[PDB]
């Protein structure tokens, strides 16, 4: 059922009510997204401030996503990182404390797995994943989409974070953009001679890259390996809590498109994918749920509580539908308990204790010889893979 | 540290040992405070948790689990048993704590530990270390009649009533304060020195802030009370050491008088200039024991200016006792012993920014929050331990 849980038919008629596979594809996906939270370095009294905690290697293992996920059979193959040529929130790019640490201007913004071959079974083709790390003015966009498009207009903050380089840095000297039409150009290229998909993901400032990203790709055409310009495969974003990324023409390009889909889910009383409430187009078909209606999450609510991606993934989990009587129920067995990786979102009555996701001591560690060194970060020289 | 053990243990009063410091008094001294230290290390504080109250881990490689293994070769302790204390009345957070929502009164209090054969080879003796638990978190106290405690004969000796009744206090519904804080240590103490009666032996008590106040409670009890003898031999008593750190006055004139009178006692205070927790309660109390004075604000690892927790916290002292070369203005700050400095910040933002070491970085990995085998996320903050005599 690959193509359909990756909205060839617009998820058509498995929305209303929630179709139980689409259920588990949707937080499969939505997880790939949480994993960038997940080795997200915020500390800001750190030197790594910035950066992944985690190495490429068992990376999943490393982020929770082995133990009971026998679809997550994915190799990571490397780390993208992203810079800002205008001031951004913090939100979006954080930074040392010292202004000294491993990098003054670019953060980890996410990485590029594939399924492996055992993976590759299990969800039926070769699936690329790119997932944008999330968050913590209308610019014309022709070095985007070309001449042919010289009226799309994107989200000034977006598109600095998608295009802007570092010529100083190892890490921005290419932007985040090139970083990632690169490795999945070599990945379409080895796999060119079986059946491939691109699966795209991310939450807030990672959902409005997922959807920039995906629709720069298939208008692009680098949805195709380079030795065979005859064979697309499907692009289609998994995203979450979206705000808004273009213009009127940006929906226009986007809907004149054969081979993209978009599944943007929307939490209700979540207000960020209002914003910008002006001037600005939703691209692709939306899934809205209510967390609300969760009898495990506090009521009332708030801007962070309502927002969190895990939240929104407690929200999947349970849905059935968005009425005031629709019932809610956990038709899928995802621990409540995640809910709090970043915030007391869950009833206090559930005793799961709020923002509970950390490192050991903060990644403080006893060395052999006694002294304790910050050890919040493994070594990554972020080179291609054979 | 064997040869020494005796002087360094203040039979002489620590005379001529403090000002300068000796070197060997020096890392004894951290020694001891470390045991303290590895109290609130196991002590969970977070009131979200239905185990709030009790300690993270068992006695099984308690000292390895707390990080006093490695590079900590005259650690070899084992922890025969956990302590455990209520109050009658109310007291502060930072006293007892409890779950938002494993017991109602009571608190994991302390432990009680001693060297093993390659230690007692190490230290020179068989020590038996108590280990009081101190303040965590964040009514008047007055002085009560402490009859209960020292006998008739010692009828106007007064105890701080909130040590007291921390040291005193039962709950009969519990499997853990059934018996007092005090007897539960008294008969473990008991067992030890019955079993090595027949081997030179100390006993060693230390604690910070308000386990300062209950080593000193319970040293003077111990020793005023004669219970460092083996019941076997009433004929051999072993020497009682207190090393407590910013601590808290505990009694009054009379029991200070009481004190004085003590041949087999000893107490070093290690005071920090800038703490004022060790002048509470300001009235109508005194000190006991021999004092040592150090100042973090001469140390140039130290946030200025610091603040209560900072000048207050037991990591600043040990920090403090590492590098202290006297208290005069024109004195030296200089670390004489490796002790890493980042240890300083476990549970304040205490060291300069400039040092680049997060503040308050004491915690279990996801606060404890693990994913088990069938994919279920649970809070396991607790080893089990029955807490039964070995």
């Given at each position: ?9 617009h ?12 259920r ?39 982020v ?11 190799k990571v ?9 205008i ?37 039926g ?31 000034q ?55 920039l ?18 064979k ?23 809907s004149?498109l ?28 939306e899934?809205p ?12 609510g708030?801007?962070?509580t ?36 970043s ?6 009555e ?36 054979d």
């Open positions: 059922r690959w193509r359909d849980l990756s909205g060839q038919n998820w058509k008629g498995m929305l209303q009510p929630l179709d139980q596979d689409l588990e594809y949707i937080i499969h996906y939505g997880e790939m997204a949480q994993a960038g939270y997940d080795t997200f370095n915020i500390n800001t009294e750190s030197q790594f401030a910035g950066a992944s905690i985690y190495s490429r290697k068992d990376f999943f293992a490393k929770g996503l082995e133990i009971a996920h026998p679809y997550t059979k994915y193959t490397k780390f993208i990182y992203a810079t800002s040529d001031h951004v929130p913090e939100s979006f790019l954080l930074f040392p404390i010292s202004r000294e640490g491993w990098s003054k201007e670019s953060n980890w913004m996410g990485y590029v797995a594939v399924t492996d071959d055992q993976g590759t079974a299990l969800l083709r070769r699936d690329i994943v790119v997932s944008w790390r999330g968050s913590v003015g209308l610019v014309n966009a022709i070095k985007i989409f070309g001449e042919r498009n010289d009226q799309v207009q994107i989200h903050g977006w598109y600095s974070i998608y295009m802007s380089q570092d010529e100083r840095s190892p890490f921005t000297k290419t932007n985040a953009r090139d970083q990632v039409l690169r490795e999945v150009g070599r990945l379409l290229e080895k796999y060119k001679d079986e059946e491939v998909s691109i699966t795209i993901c991310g939450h807030s400032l990672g959902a409005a890259l997922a959807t990203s995906a629709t720069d790709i298939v208008a692009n055409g680098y949805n195709r390996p380079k030795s065979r310009p005859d697309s495969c499907p692009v289609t974003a998994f995203v979450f809590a979206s705000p808004r990324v273009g213009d009127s023409d940006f929906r226009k390009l986007f004149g054969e081979d993209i889909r978009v599944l943007r889910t929307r939490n209700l009383p979540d207000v960020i994918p209002i914003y910008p409430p002006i001037g600005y187009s939703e691209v692709g078909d899934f749920i209510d967390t609300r209606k969760s009898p495990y999450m506090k009521s009332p708030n801007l962070a309502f927002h969190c991606l895990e939240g929104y993934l407690h929200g999947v989990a349970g849905t059935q539908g968005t009425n005031k009587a629709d019932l809610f129920r956990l038709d899928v067995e995802r621990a409540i308990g995640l809910v709090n990786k915030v007391d979102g869950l009833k206090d559930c005793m799961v204790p709020g923002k509970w996701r950390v490192l050991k001591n903060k990644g403080m560690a006893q060395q052999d010889d006694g002294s304790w060194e910050l050890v919040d970060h493994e070594i990554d020289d972020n080179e291609d893979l």
